[PDB]
Amino acid sequence: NDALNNIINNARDGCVPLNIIPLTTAAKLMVVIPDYNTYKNTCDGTTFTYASALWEIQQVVDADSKIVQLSEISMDNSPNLAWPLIVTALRAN
Amino acid sequence: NNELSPVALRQMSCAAGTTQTACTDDNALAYYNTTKGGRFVLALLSDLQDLKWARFPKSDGTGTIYTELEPPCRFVTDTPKGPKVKYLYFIKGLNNLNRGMVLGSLAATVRLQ
Amino acid sequence: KMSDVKCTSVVLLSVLQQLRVESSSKLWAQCVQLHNDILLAKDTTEAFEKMVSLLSVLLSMQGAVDINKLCE
Amino acid sequence: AQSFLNRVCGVSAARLTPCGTGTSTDVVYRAFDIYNDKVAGFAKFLKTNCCRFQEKDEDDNLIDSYFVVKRHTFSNYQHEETIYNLLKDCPAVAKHDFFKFRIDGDMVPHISRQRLTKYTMADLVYALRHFDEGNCDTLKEILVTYNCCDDDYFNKKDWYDFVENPDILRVYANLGERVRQALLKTVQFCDAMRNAGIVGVLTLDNQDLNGNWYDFGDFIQTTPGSGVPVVDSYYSLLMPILTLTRALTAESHVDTDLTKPYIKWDLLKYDFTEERLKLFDRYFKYWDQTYHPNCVNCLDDRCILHCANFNVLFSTVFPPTSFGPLVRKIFVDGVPFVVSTGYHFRELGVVHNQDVNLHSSRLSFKELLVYAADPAMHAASGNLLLDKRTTCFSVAALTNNVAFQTVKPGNFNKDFYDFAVSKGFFKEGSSVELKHFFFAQDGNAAISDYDYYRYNLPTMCDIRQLLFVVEVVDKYFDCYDGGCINANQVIVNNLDKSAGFPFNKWGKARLYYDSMSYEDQDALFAYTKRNVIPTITQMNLKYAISAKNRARTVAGVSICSTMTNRQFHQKLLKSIAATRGATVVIGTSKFYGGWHNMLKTVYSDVENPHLMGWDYPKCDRAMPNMLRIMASLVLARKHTTCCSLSHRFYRLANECAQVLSEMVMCGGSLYVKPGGTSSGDATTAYANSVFNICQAVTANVNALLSTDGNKIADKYVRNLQHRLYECLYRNRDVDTDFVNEFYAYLRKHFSMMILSDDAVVCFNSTYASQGLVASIKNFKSVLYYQNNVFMSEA
Ligand SMILES: [Zn+2]
């Protein structure tokens, strides 16, 4: 990606620590979630910023890889779900 | 409530000068501690304006050491004819411990101005 | 006595394993819990409790034609 | 009486209330740091030359301030006077006041230290290093005194724990800031005491708990502008508290102010130096041996210890992204790559490769390999991840769906069991009854386990006594030999195991130990003596009988690590493995009466013998880093010819990157391993044993010094202890006479047999009761203050 080549030109020397490359330059985001609470506190709505950039939800699969719409996740449809849902969001821009 | 160290640091006279060769055989006053390794030396005392090197025979007398000195510390002792300028060189890179015990034994021995 | 209960449980969870029950999740959770428990039991009673409260898991399946095996 | 009590209320806040007696002194049980000419130590005496007044408050409630009035010699009264009169300025001085008062016909002098604090920094540091839950009260009374938490907390049992109730941390944390305060005032103090030209030493039990100082006795005069302090008892004792309570956390805020948020280091800044050095020069200024951030510049390893500490401290203030490999883009024949050209550990400063080379056409097997195992390529192209099941800072993903693990049951063996009952077994009430089983584990097994590294903290371990007991432990290993070897001398067993990741997509070690010449392997080895090779690692679930339903994991390491650490250690590892009759007993069969021989060794004439073992609660997660480096250093010590210097230093670096804190391909993703060992590399059981011995010694050192001074009877041992302290703090360099002396003393009264993390000690009984050999309670105390877990006595 250009964005990398950017970020490396911007280097002081051509050396950047690794832990900020997949964070800033990478695209498709995966997220794990254990609970409904953490869900509604951290990936609630249809989008969100995080690491200071926007992200869009695509699909929310679960433990058995069953597609689950962003609707069923009520507070109270929760105790009927395999719980560590995987949210596959995207580098929103 | 925690006393430091009752001392036993001796004082001799020997050789020092300004350069490796300028050290005349008798002009400096060594303060030292004979530790596990011979008469292990700590500090120098003099009256001359500057002495950047010193020379002392070894444990058995093989060679003469070429031990440089500190930018000397300034002070004035008293001799029956008034004040008298004196310098206290240290062997460079000598940590606070022995500097401290040397000052202890010294200021004990010599009362300053 | 009870020692056979622990044994039977080991056989049993092995069965429910090989019947491909782990495609679920929540199943495998409740089962592995019942297992890990009776394998620390202390008194035949609550054992037998967890025992049946498991076994029925298998019964609800339809891989077994127990009407056969009960041939004696 | 009162006129006195009046006359020592001087001019201020006349609200006093003598919690003393009348006009007599007091008797306090206070824990000094003492070292005259005859006694020595850090121990809890009974002091009594003081009258003590508790200053009260308006509304006539008590209030934490004090007037402490001491009575001593006239001559000393003058010394203290002229000194105080020289130095009544640098605000870290508790405002004294002298006077002469009459008791009877006696004109007794009196000094009045004004507004102090009931305790002193001593009581803190002491009754935190030498914990013992049966009676830790002063801890209770401090922690409530400074609003760290309200009394109710303490009755909820397991309040002192760590593996349990780990919220306890935050409680300690609440204190931290005030500790920091002390440091700062002391520096002000030191500067004054220099320019006014004084000499003396600072000790903890002169320190009201706020920050001031007082007990100005033994200082002596000097020229101005040339006064020296002595700060190597002070810090070097204060060291480990400094990262229990996190006294540096008020240093990341927008201006060292709890209110403001944080600084935000721009994501790209990895260097960080003049910061490190500036922090150091503002806090530990009067320290007495140079400090040089990047440990590359250090000399004989011991300077590497004395700077690896300060880094393990200054590194809990910088951000946890700019730690780790430093990638950069290269060109394989006009083709952009990203490869890890360096590293930036949490201690070892910055480290840069030394044979790096851009723009290459065709790359051979060697470098091909060393590229497929760097995580630069792997994570540089993967989906960003964020996990809310752990706390360990995740990093990247790889697949597009995580993988879940499960651990099937065991399977029965009916017949043998049917036999067994047929022989009249398991008939109820038996004293043999099944107890070990094949426990089964559900889905999220791994990560729900690998989470445990959150039990691992940073730590600063006191630097002086460490720089000594490393020498004694060293002495325990003077009967072996090792050094670099060559390919045709390593020896592999069962050359068929796993090969970590990703090399396990292609087969076992048959290939890689096979698809390479000897010269291949020698290029590799004598290469990493000048470069760094960050690696990965896999976690595996064990499947075997047990007795506790938890999980198990074993870190399968990637081949480019073992394939060198072998070559580098094999000679020693054998030399230990095959020697009969010593301390370490790795590799001595228990068959053919070899066991009996083991015992009739580890007895060996210690007069009044008792036997004690112990066990380490969560041994391989909670081991702080410093001790791991200490193990690796003691092993490499014997390499003095094969290696050189920079060869070693990069070799240590390669190990610390490959087993201590590198990424962990747990599950289907990458995390970071903040610390702790890793039970799968090339040098475990040995390193565990060494660490273990380090704990046993440190316990004995404390048990010695901690003892009072003037009840020791054997004048010989008293002169030991005294000599010990002297060699330990005052001195700077080793006393081989003393060290040999000590080692012998131990072998005579505290003999020990060691397997990898599994001990037995046979020790001289009545000594224990006299406290000159570390009985159990000292083990509690050490596991606490420098393994920061709590070793139950069950
Ligand atoms: Zn250094």
Q: Check whether the bond before D502 is cis (ω within 30° of 0).
A: yes
Distance CA D453, CA D345 (A): 18
* Residue of D415, D435, D437, D448 to mutate for C, most C C-beta atoms under 10 A: D437
Verify whether the Cβ–Cβ distance A22 to D384 is below 8 Å: yes
Name the one residue in this structure whose structure tokens are 């794990």. Answer: A32
DSSP-based three-state secondary structure for D575: helix
Within the 327-386 window of chain D, which residues sit less than 8 Å (CB to CB) from chain A? 327-329, 338, 340-342, 344, 375-376, 379-380, 382-386
Q: Which DSSP symbol is given to D220? A: B
Q: How far is CA D200 from CA D121, D214, D222, D231, D282, in A?
A: 19, 13, 11, 10, 21
Domain count, chain C: 1
First-residue to last-residue Cα distance in chain C:
22
Whether D461 has a binding-site annotation, put simply, is no
Whether D307 has a binding-site annotation, put simply, is yes
List D758, D765, D769, D792, catalytic entry: D758
User: Could you tell me if D612 and D700 are in contact, meaning their C-beta atoms sit under 8 angstroms apart?
Assistant: no
DSSP-based three-state secondary structure for C33: helix
Whether D484 has a binding-site annotation, put simply, is yes
Of A5, A22, A27, the CB nearest to D396: A22
Q: What is the DSSP track for B23-41?
A: -EEEEEEEEEEE-SSSEEE
Q: Which DSSP symbol is given to D658? A: I
Maximal CA-CA distance, chain D: 101
Burial of D326: CB neighbours in 10 Å, binned 0-12, 13-18, 19+ = buried
Q: How many CB pairs under 8 A join B and D?
A: 68
Write out the two tokens for D726: 């002297």
The torsion region of residue D605 among left (phi > 0), alpha (psi -120 to 50) and beta comes to left
3-state secondary structure D695-747: HHHHHHHHHHHHCCCCCCCCHHHHHHHHHHHHHHHHCCCCCHHHHHHHHHHHH
Write out the two tokens for D589: 């069969």
Residue A33 neighbours by CB under 8 Å, 6+ apart: A39, A42, A43, A84, A85, A86, A87, D388
Write out the two tokens for D252: 């990341």
The torsion region of residue D339 among left (phi > 0), alpha (psi -120 to 50) and beta comes to beta
Whether D656 has a binding-site annotation, put simply, is no
Residue D158 neighbours by CB under 8 Å, 6+ apart: D164, D165
Verify whether the Cβ–Cβ distance D326 to A16 is below 8 Å: yes
What CATH number is given to the structural domain containing A50?
A: 3.30.70.3540
Q: What is the DSSP track for D126-179?
A: HHHHT--GGG-HHHHHHHHHTTSS-GGGGGSSS-S-SSSSTTHHHHHHHHHHHH
Neighbours of D404 (CB within 10 A): 20
Domain holding C71, by residue range, is 2-72
Q: Which chain A residues are within 8 Å of D340, Cβ to Cβ?
A: 18
Write out the two tokens for D282: 């503002």
Task: Provide the shortest C-alpha distance from residue D351 to chain A (in Å).
Answer: 12
Q: Is C23 on the interface with D (CB under 8 A)?
A: no
Domain count, chain A: 1
Write out the two tokens for C43: 């008194």
Neighbours of B84 (CB within 10 A): 13
What is the β-pairing status of strands D62-70 and D51-56? antiparallel
List D33, D681, D757, D781, catalytic entry: D757
Q: State the distance from the centre of ligand 1 to the C-alpha of D467, rounded, in angstroms.
A: 13
Distance CA D19, CA D52 (A): 7
Write out the two tokens for D658: 């490959």
Task: Provide the shortest C-alpha distance from residue D410 to chain C (in Å).
Answer: 7
Residue B40 neighbours by CB under 8 Å, 6+ apart: B32, B33, B34
Which chain C residue is nearest to residue D433, measuring alpha carbons? C3
How many H helices and E strands in chain B? 1, 7
Task: Provide the shortest C-alpha distance from residue D583 to chain B (in Å).
Answer: 31
Residue D226 neighbours by CB under 8 Å, 6+ apart: B73, D194, D197
Write out the two tokens for D110: 């009196």
Verify whether the Cβ–Cβ distance C23 to A63 is below 8 Å: no
**Which of D310, D390, D340 lies closest to D673 in space, CA to CA?**
D390
Verify whether the Cβ–Cβ distance D440 to C7 is below 8 Å: no
Distance CA A43, CA D536 (A): 30
Verify whether the Cβ–Cβ distance A17 to D376 is below 8 Å: no
Resolution in A: 3.8
The string over D147-165, giving b where at least 16 C-beta atoms fall within 10 Å of a residue's C-beta and e elsewhere, is ebbeeebbeeeebbebbeb
**Which of D264, D241, D72 lies closest to D172 in space, CA to CA?**
D241
Distance CA C7, CA D326 (A): 55
Q: State the distance from the centre of ligand 1 to the C-alpha of D644, rounded, in angstroms.
A: 18
User: Could you tell me if D419 and D381 are in contact, meaning their C-beta atoms sit under 8 angstroms apart?
Assistant: no
Task: Provide the shortest C-alpha distance from residue C67 to chain D (in Å).
Answer: 24
D756 catalytic, yes or no? yes
Residue D500 neighbours by CB under 8 Å, 6+ apart: D535, D536, D537, D538, D556, D557, D558, D559
Domain holding A65, by residue range, is 3-92
User: Could you tell me if D344 and D357 are in contact, meaning their C-beta atoms sit under 8 angstroms apart?
Assistant: no
Distance CA D745, CA D739 (A): 10
**Which of C25, C51, C29, C26 lies closest to C38 in space, CA to CA?**
C51
Which phi and psi (to 5°) does residue D30 adopt? -120, 150
